[PDB]
Design an enzyme around this catalytic site. Structure first.
Site, PDB file in Angstrom:
ATOM      1  CD  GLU A  91       0.020  -0.135   7.109  1.00  0.00           C
ATOM      2  OE1 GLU A  91      -0.546   0.971   6.686  1.00  0.00           O
ATOM      3  OE2 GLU A  91      -0.156  -0.524   8.336  1.00  0.00           O
TER       4      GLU A  91
HETATM    5  C1  LIG Z   1       6.078   6.410   0.273  1.00  0.00           C
HETATM    6  C2  LIG Z   1       5.983   6.120   1.737  1.00  0.00           C
HETATM    7  C3  LIG Z   1       5.091   6.617   2.541  1.00  0.00           C
HETATM    8  C4  LIG Z   1       5.023   6.492   4.238  1.00  0.00           C
HETATM    9  N1  LIG Z   1       4.012   6.741   4.888  1.00  0.00           N
HETATM   10  C5  LIG Z   1       4.263   6.430   5.970  1.00  0.00           C
HETATM   11  C6  LIG Z   1       3.063   7.154   6.950  1.00  0.00           C
HETATM   12  O1  LIG Z   1       1.843   7.733   6.424  1.00  0.00           O
HETATM   13  N2  LIG Z   1       2.997   7.160   8.261  1.00  0.00           N
HETATM   14  C7  LIG Z   1       4.026   6.383   8.947  1.00  0.00           C
HETATM   15  O2  LIG Z   1       3.938   6.095   9.929  1.00  0.00           O
HETATM   16  N3  LIG Z   1       5.041   5.618   8.197  1.00  0.00           N
HETATM   17  C8  LIG Z   1       5.056   5.914   6.954  1.00  0.00           C
HETATM   18  N4  LIG Z   1       6.173   5.397   5.869  1.00  0.00           N
HETATM   19  C9  LIG Z   1       7.247   4.304   6.620  1.00  0.00           C
HETATM   20  C10 LIG Z   1       7.300   2.982   6.209  1.00  0.00           C
HETATM   21  O3  LIG Z   1       6.171   2.236   6.262  1.00  0.00           O
HETATM   22  C11 LIG Z   1       8.598   2.375   6.512  1.00  0.00           C
HETATM   23  O4  LIG Z   1       9.250   2.606   5.157  1.00  0.00           O
HETATM   24  C12 LIG Z   1       8.716   1.073   6.920  1.00  0.00           C
HETATM   25  O5  LIG Z   1       7.732   0.850   8.092  1.00  0.00           O
HETATM   26  C13 LIG Z   1      10.189   0.451   6.910  1.00  0.00           C
HETATM   27  O6  LIG Z   1      11.004   1.086   7.399  1.00  0.00           O
HETATM   28  P1  LIG Z   1      12.432   1.696   6.781  1.00  0.00           P
HETATM   29  O7  LIG Z   1      11.932   2.014   5.619  1.00  0.00           O
HETATM   30  O8  LIG Z   1      13.296   2.511   7.588  1.00  0.00           O
HETATM   31  O9  LIG Z   1      13.220   0.315   6.657  1.00  0.00           O
HETATM   32  P2  LIG Z   1      14.219  -0.447   7.720  1.00  0.00           P
HETATM   33  O10 LIG Z   1      13.515  -0.730   8.940  1.00  0.00           O
HETATM   34  O11 LIG Z   1      15.522   0.208   7.973  1.00  0.00           O
HETATM   35  O12 LIG Z   1      14.546  -1.713   7.124  1.00  0.00           O
HETATM   36  C14 LIG Z   1      15.244  -1.897   6.197  1.00  0.00           C
HETATM   37  C15 LIG Z   1      15.611  -3.444   5.836  1.00  0.00           C
HETATM   38  O13 LIG Z   1      15.826  -4.298   6.869  1.00  0.00           O
HETATM   39  C16 LIG Z   1      14.954  -5.272   7.036  1.00  0.00           C
HETATM   40  N5  LIG Z   1      14.803  -5.466   8.389  1.00  0.00           N
HETATM   41  C17 LIG Z   1      14.541  -4.716   9.563  1.00  0.00           C
HETATM   42  N6  LIG Z   1      14.479  -5.145  10.693  1.00  0.00           N
HETATM   43  C18 LIG Z   1      14.759  -6.596  10.532  1.00  0.00           C
HETATM   44  C19 LIG Z   1      14.982  -7.486  11.412  1.00  0.00           C
HETATM   45  N7  LIG Z   1      14.810  -7.479  12.778  1.00  0.00           N
HETATM   46  N8  LIG Z   1      15.312  -8.870  10.744  1.00  0.00           N
HETATM   47  C20 LIG Z   1      15.475  -9.044   9.451  1.00  0.00           C
HETATM   48  N9  LIG Z   1      15.419  -7.910   8.548  1.00  0.00           N
HETATM   49  C21 LIG Z   1      15.061  -6.631   9.073  1.00  0.00           C
HETATM   50  C22 LIG Z   1      13.531  -4.731   6.555  1.00  0.00           C
HETATM   51  O14 LIG Z   1      12.844  -5.761   6.284  1.00  0.00           O
HETATM   52  C23 LIG Z   1      14.118  -3.890   5.036  1.00  0.00           C
HETATM   53  O15 LIG Z   1      14.270  -4.854   4.425  1.00  0.00           O
HETATM   54  C24 LIG Z   1       5.908   5.499   4.649  1.00  0.00           C
HETATM   55  C25 LIG Z   1       7.074   5.065   3.932  1.00  0.00           C
HETATM   56  C26 LIG Z   1       6.995   5.291   2.459  1.00  0.00           C
HETATM   57  C27 LIG Z   1       8.238   4.708   1.735  1.00  0.00           C
END
Ligand SMILES: Cc1cc2nc3c(=O)[nH]c(=O)nc-3n(C[C@H](O)[C@H](O)[C@H](O)COP(=O)(O)OP(=O)(O)OC[C@H]3O[C@@H](n4cnc5c(N)ncnc54)[C@H](O)[C@@H]3O)c2cc1C
Ligand SMILES: Cc1cc2nc3c(=O)[nH]c(=O)nc-3n(C[C@H](O)[C@H](O)[C@H](O)COP(=O)(O)OP(=O)(O)OC[C@H]3O[C@@H](n4cnc5c(N)ncnc54)[C@H](O)[C@@H]3O)c2cc1C
Lengths: 584, 572
Positions: A398
């Site tokens: 979220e």
């Molecule tokens: C078990 C699981 C179930 C999921 N289910 C769904 C689902 O049903 N539907 C769906 O749509 N999604 C789902 N997700 C996706 C999920 O909510 C994402 O993991 C998440 O939105 C963040 O994306 P990312 O993991 O690629 O992290 P990234 O976006 O790659 O972030 C990596 C790090 O960089 C930081 N960061 C990113 N941008 C910035 C910025 N501009 N400034 C400073 N720091 C930054 C982040 O805070 C984090 O610490 C699921 C994820 C998991 C793990």
């Protein structure tokens, strides 16, 4: 009603907050119905769910469907039971008992179904909702991609109208889609012609739709999580959700709801962690007494319970704001759903705060719950061990807590631009009163005083940072997060104060002793953090003589007679250990 | 030799501290050897170890044994290789890269073998050590029971000298015994006639000895963990280790070693978390750039690195103290073992500080590493996911962190009675002047607060757990600050200011935050202890001790991070 973000600038009153003490007998019954379902039906199977026996999840979901637990947020005219927002918050709170199954349920009733509830046209609603409301169909939400998580509008999945003009042809992969093993319906985001970011209702049975194997995860192991694979997936033209190129409007609105719902969920889990830790502390003996007799154990329990009180207070406050905005709406407006979405979007700030604050309070409570259990906390045979693992993802869900923090100050500033919040006009009033320079006698006098001064400190610091960097404040992330942390602590403090104040005026001082204690202890420590966040921001923003001026202004705002919290925490703990649960 | 705990009351100099910049070529070469073994031999099998293929564990241990990695702490006279304490700490640091297999290895060379090394008689040593030292036999240590964890002397396992007077008969269960699936030798504690808490060398093949199935654990899954089941277990009279009813001497001494060694292990893990998080930050793009370019990401890495510097500095300081006392001993003293135990027991305070501080630094680093990975941090195919689960038990091992904090202040009092122990604008321009100032005032604050607490409660201070932990936390932060300061001061004197910019930045940012925690702990303690006008005066004295011109840490953390992301690892 009360405007979103106005708590920062206006003197909010006990009459303007909703608290758990305001629950009706209906709310309490629905909470008990859900709890009985979870305890009687779900828990005996939870160990098989964690082993990915998804047939059981499906069966349990449909049993939940028969009790109306999948259709609380769906209007009656579309086959739902149309409960109020307090009721569906209570349902999520009680679902948290079931670990990852709460995630399964939440993805179905929240991010999966609500896009149709809020943004579906009449035909889409009458088609999909009656089935989703009973669990006859199950939903999932598919936004994230391998290359796009926090930057969710960077989706690379494409959609192109076929030669006949009858179907969109979708290509790409959506990653980590909860419920993928058994969802019938997926809300998928894709760019039409690789340009226009748009949402689509995509059935599992459409041509070209498949899934990867299950992910291997740290926790919430019983939630299904797979990649959705779209290989010339054929989606009827009429399954476009909302308008072409306006997929962001859906994604942003859904996010707000996901945020506060997760807040409610983490609050349920934190209460359960308090409960099992208190029960464990009373039974485990070392040095020939219950470890419950040790002050360090008592101190951990009191910190856990006081944070949980502040989280519970601030989350239901937000749910209450949504409900009182809903009160304005005619039956035609609720039915359409655009006005329901705006009734919560108004409180986007409060939603983001709840999400970050709730997930961090739960993080702390499961961590101390494990420590209280010792080596048993590290054994899969113990409930706290699973909770510890399940909790970790909530700070990422979220919107990561970083992103949720970064958007808070800008949201305040955008509301000041659009004229919704008198921020400039309020920032200049404070500049005078500072150059103008005891506490009071009522219960909570000191805490009301800190809440007021916290507001001034947040305004001062945020004003100073904005005036310093201007439009380029967006690059100063460390500062933005300090301001966000100040606002978050302030919201939790005020929620705790006002809830306790309301209780006193409702049921007396003597009966609300535990709330007063949680409030004194939480406020003192949260205000301490506020002071440190402000200092770090002032030092990063100014120097020399001008910096010493600002720091003396902060000292003036921050001076008070500190309390001795050590005996108060022992008093809090005594009652927790007496009831063997979180209590209020 | 600097006395245990004297850092609180004396001005320690750069000459009285050991740092990694003091490592010899032999120290470095043993580190490299261990790392090559881990990376080339252990890591390709680690996924199978996590699935409990212990056949692989045993083979890998015996292969480590052939490189001498299981006999570093065992005298040459008993078939080991007899290296110094710095070497064996480095072996532990490098083993941490292999997750739960570092716990396997550690339980064998540490708690499993050391009771015989340190407290065995000549016949016990000559019989067991040559085989333990090469891994031909593997060891485990069995103290804990279902009813007794922190209260380890509450053990219910009984020992009864049989009618013939040739064997003790042991009955009970020992819980959570590392290496149980494959250990040949178990050090077992039991109460003779249900009264005299004693230690025993117990072989796996002895009559009445068996183990439960494996525990299902949150982390370190590749470590074997079972209940040891003693049902009329037959142990020869001559296998009594130490003296009847004096089992506590062994257990307390072994705990000191377990503590600093775990401190060392957690430093190796924290460095690894920094490295993989910096590598990930550079490769992962969001919003069209590497997330490494986001200040919040930079701030996380810089906090992880500075804490790791303070932990690495304070842990090797303790290892050096041990080594310095070892320097004195004759070859015969080292052989008898008792003087080796004494040489570390002296630094019991520093060992507990290291164990709590190292385990909490690692807890922070793995948690921020997972956060840097986002959802990938929650997926089992990423290394950080496994680290996050492995780490949680370190705060419970070797004394829970609560217990380790609770014994610190009371230990300062016992060293006192025994006779081992008794303006901010002036600061200046020289490198580290402010930080030296803060370290000195931190000592004053610690002594002030402990002194006031003891005055109020006297001997009943042991019941005031919250205040005791505040004192322990002040002492821990102080030891970490001073260690980072002296290490950095030493480096500047040795190789110059310019080449040590990273160390200066670590020390500046760590010292400001740690000193702020000290002030907060002192304030809570004074408020609990005094009231009225005496409280106002003490709070005013604390103000005087804490007054200074604070640094702007935000640009310094950005600088720290820029160097971490350039090297893609923790550097100093
Ligand atoms: C078990 C699981 C179930 C999921 N289910 C769904 C689902 O049903 N539907 C769906 O749509 N999604 C789902 N997700 C996706 C999920 O909510 C994402 O993991 C998440 O939105 C963040 O994306 P990312 O993991 O690629 O992290 P990234 O976006 O790659 O972030 C990596 C790090 O960089 C930081 N960061 C990113 N941008 C910035 C910025 N501009 N400034 C400073 N720091 C930054 C982040 O805070 C984090 O610490 C699921 C994820 C998991 C793990
Ligand atoms: C995976 C694993 C492997 C292990 N391997 C071994 C092994 O090989 N050999 C071995 O001997 N042991 C081993 N142990 C035992 C382990 O180190 C114990 O868990 C540890 O020593 C604590 O005991 P306990 O878990 O029963 O917790 P408890 O002693 O019940 O403690 C519970 C809680 O109460 C607190 N507490 C207890 N007393 C006090 C007090 N006086 N004041 C304030 N708080 C207090 C503790 O800090 C903790 O928070 C292993 C444990 C695990 C989990």
């Amino acid at each position: 009603a009360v405007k979103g973000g106005s708590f920062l600038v206006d003197e909010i009153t006990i009459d303007q907050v909703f608290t758990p003490e305001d629950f009706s007998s209906e709310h309490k019954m629905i909470a008990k119905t859900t709890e009985d379902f979870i305890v009687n039906e779900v828990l005996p199977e939870l160990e098989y769910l964690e082993q990915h026996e998804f047939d059981r999840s499906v069966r349990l979901l449909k049993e939940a469907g028969e009790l109306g637990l999948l259709g609380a947020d769906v209007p009656e005219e579309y086959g739902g039971i149309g409960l109020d927002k307090v009721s569906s918050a209570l349902i999520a709170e009680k679902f948290s008992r079931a670990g990852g199954f709460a995630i399964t349920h939440g993805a179905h009733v929240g991010i999966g179904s609500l896009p149709i509830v809020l943004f579906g046209n009449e035909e889409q609603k009458k088609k999909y909702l009656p089935l989703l409301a009973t669990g006859e169909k199950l939903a999932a939400y598919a936004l994230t991609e391998p290359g796009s998580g926090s930057d969710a509008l960077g989706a690379k999945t494409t959609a192109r109208l076929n030669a006949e003009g009858t179907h969109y042809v979708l290509n790409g992969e959506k990653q980590w889609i909860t419920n993928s093993a058994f969802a019938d319906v997926f809300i998928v985001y894709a760019k039409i012609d690789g340009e226009h970011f748009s949402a689509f209702i995509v059935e599992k049975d459409y041509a070209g739709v498949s899934t990867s194997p299950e992910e291997k995860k740290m926790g919430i192991k019983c939630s299904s999580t797979r990649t959705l694979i779209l290989e010339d997936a054929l989606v009827p033209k009429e399954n476009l959700l909302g308008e072409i190129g306006k997929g962001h409007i859906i994604a942003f609105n859904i996010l707000n709801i996901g945020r506060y719902k997760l807040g409610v969920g983490t609050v349920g889990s934190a209460k359960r962690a308090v409960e099992i830790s208190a029960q464990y502390a009373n039974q485990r003996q070392q040095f020939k007494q219950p470890i419950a007799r040790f002050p360090l154990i008592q101190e951990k329990l009191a910190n856990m319970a006081a944070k949980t009180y502040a989280a519970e207070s601030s989350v239901y406050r937000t749910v209450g704001l949504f409900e009182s905005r809903m009160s304005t709406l005619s039956e035609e407006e609720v039915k359409d759903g655009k006005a329901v979405a705006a009734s919560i979007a108004e409180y986007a700030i409060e939603c983001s705060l709840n999400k970050v604050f709730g997930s961090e309070v739960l993080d702390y409570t499961v961590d101390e719950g494990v420590q209280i259990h010792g080596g048993y906390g590290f054994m899969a045979e113990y409930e706290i061990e699973r909770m510890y693992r399940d909790s970790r993802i909530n700070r990422i869900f979220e919107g990561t807590n970083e992103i949720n923090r970064l958007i808070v100050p800008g949201t305040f500033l955008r509301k000041a631009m659009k004229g919704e919040l008198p921020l400039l006009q309020k920032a200049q009033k404070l500049q005078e009163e500072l150059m103008m320079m005891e506490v009071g006698d009522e219960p909570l006098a000191l805490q009301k005083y800190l809440v007021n001064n916290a507001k001034k400190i947040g305004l001062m610091v945020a004003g100073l940072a904005a005036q310093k960097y201007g439009k380029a404040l967006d690059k100063e992330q460390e500062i933005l997060v300090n301001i966000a942390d100040i606002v978050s602590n302030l919201y939790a403090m005020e929620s705790a104060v006002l809830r306790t104040e309301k209780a006193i005026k409702t049921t007396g001082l003597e009966k609300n002793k535990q709330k007063v204690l949680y409030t004194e202890v939480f406020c003192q420590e949260a205000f301490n953090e506020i002071e440190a966040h402000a200092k770090e921001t002032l030092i990063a923003v100014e120097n020399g003589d001008m910096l010493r001026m600002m720091l003396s202004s902060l000292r003036k705002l921050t001076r008070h007679t500190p309390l001795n919290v050590i005996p108060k925490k022992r008093e809090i703990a005594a009652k927790i250990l007496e009831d063997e649960r979180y209590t209020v």
